[PDB]
Amino acid sequence: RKTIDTFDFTAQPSVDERRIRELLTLSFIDRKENILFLGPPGIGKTHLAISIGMEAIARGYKTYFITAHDLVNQLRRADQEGKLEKKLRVFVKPTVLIIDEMGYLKLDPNSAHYLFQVIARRYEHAPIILTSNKSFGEWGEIVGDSVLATAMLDRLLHHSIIFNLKGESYRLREKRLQEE
Ligand SMILES: Nc1ncnc2c1ncn2[C@@H]1O[C@H](COP(=O)(O)OP(=O)(O)O)[C@@H](O)[C@H]1O
Ligand code: BEF
């Protein structure tokens, strides 16, 4: 549970606080816009995603957080038990779905399509907030199918607000400060 008020914009100058404050108005929800935070590990992607989610919850919007690998794996099981459609509603019903950590783990090519279904069903219905360390061109490798990746991104990116973050890891930052 992280909020915008604990985010140090001096330590992370690659993100414009103004743009983030625009997100916190939650305008993106009615505009059906997805929010994407991209960049290397530890730079505040998940922090910012959770901050927006926390604002949504406070403003009365149902919000759900899950990593990409967990989402794919859970939907796989639900499908094996002939209850795919029921698990799908869990990820489609929330007004704001945060799909965290897209791209560290290559997804089972046999299960990558579960992610497409969530994206396709939420498409032009309810926002997805996504964090990833990979460029869009690398998504083919993640899902094990360049064609499926293009289809996913076509929907995801159509109505979207993209943040490309940079900088040194805040994790290693805090580690230095202790040592020093
Ligand atoms: N500018 C920042 N200001 C305050 N805390 C930060 C900042 N960037 C990262 N953190 C914190 O460092 C840790 C790593 O940030 P995180 O967003 O989880 O990394 P990632 O970009 O890989 O998702 C978290 O605990 C986060 O709250
Ligand atoms: F390590 Be971060 F979640 F990309």
Ligand SMILES: [Mg+2]
């Ligand atoms: Mg993260």
